């Protein structure tokens, strides 16, 4: 149990999010919210109940809307789980998601220990 300052969470967690942005082109389909009408995928919101993307996570850090570090981690995992759920395992976006998940898994473990 701990009260976290939003600036403390930003300085600690934003580097792990930037490590995902730096993956090019793997991060490109994750940088903005999925737009099913534009992309022609009307079943997306049938499958994905709670969408999440990098720009939404970044804004929540910038505005202090995470109270605790595990809320940030849950949003990153939600973004990954949505992409693995909707896209087929042979697809470009599914393989992109696995690469981003590999990067995040290596970045987030010591950061979470330092925060407590
Ligand atoms: C995590 N992204 C994602 O699931 N999608 C759905 C997939 C069918 O293709 C996409 C293409 C573009 C340009 C942006 C997002 C996506």
Three-class SS state of 27: coil
Burial of 11 (0-12, 13-18, 19+ CB in 10 A): exposed
What's the 16 CA to ligand 1 centre distance in angstroms?
A: 22
- Closest CA relative to residue 5, chosen from 114, 108, 112, 115: 115
Method used for this model? X-ray
What's the 29 CA to ligand 1 centre distance in angstroms?
A: 5
What's the 10 CA to ligand 1 centre distance in angstroms?
A: 27
Residues with CB under 6 A from ligand 1: 29-30, 34, 39, 41, 83, 86-87, 93
Place of tokens 């403390």: 8
Place of tokens 């570090």: 69
Three-class SS state of 60: helix
Q: Which atom of ligand 1 is nearest to the CA of 34?
A: 15
What token pair was written down for 59? Answer: 């804004």
Q: What is the resolution of this structure in A?
A: 1.7
What token pair was written down for 34? Answer: 């999925």
Domain layout of the chain by residue ranges: 1-116
User: Widest CA span of the chain, in angstroms?
Assistant: 44
Q: Which CATH architecture does the domain made up of 1-116 adopt? A: Up-down Bundle (1.20)
Find the DSSP H helices in the chain.
6-21, 36-39, 44-47, 54-62, 69-86, 92-115
Q: How far apart are CA 10 and CA 15, in angstroms?
A: 8
């Amino acid at each position: 149990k701990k009260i976290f300052k939003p600036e403390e969470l930003r300085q600690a967690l934003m580097p792990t999010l930037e490590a995902l942005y730096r993956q090019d082109p793997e991060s490109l389909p994750f940088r903005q919210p999925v737009d099913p009408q534009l992309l022609g995928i009307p079943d997306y919101f049938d499958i994905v109940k709670n969408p999440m993307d990098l720009s939404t996570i970044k804004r929540k850090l910038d505005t202090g809307q995470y109270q605790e570090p595990w809320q940030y981690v849950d949003d990153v995992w939600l973004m990954f789980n949505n992409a693995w759920l909707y896209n087929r395992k042979t697809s470009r976006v599914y393989k992109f998601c696995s690469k981003l998940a590999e990067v995040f898994e290596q970045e987030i473990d010591p950061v979470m220990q330092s925060l407590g």
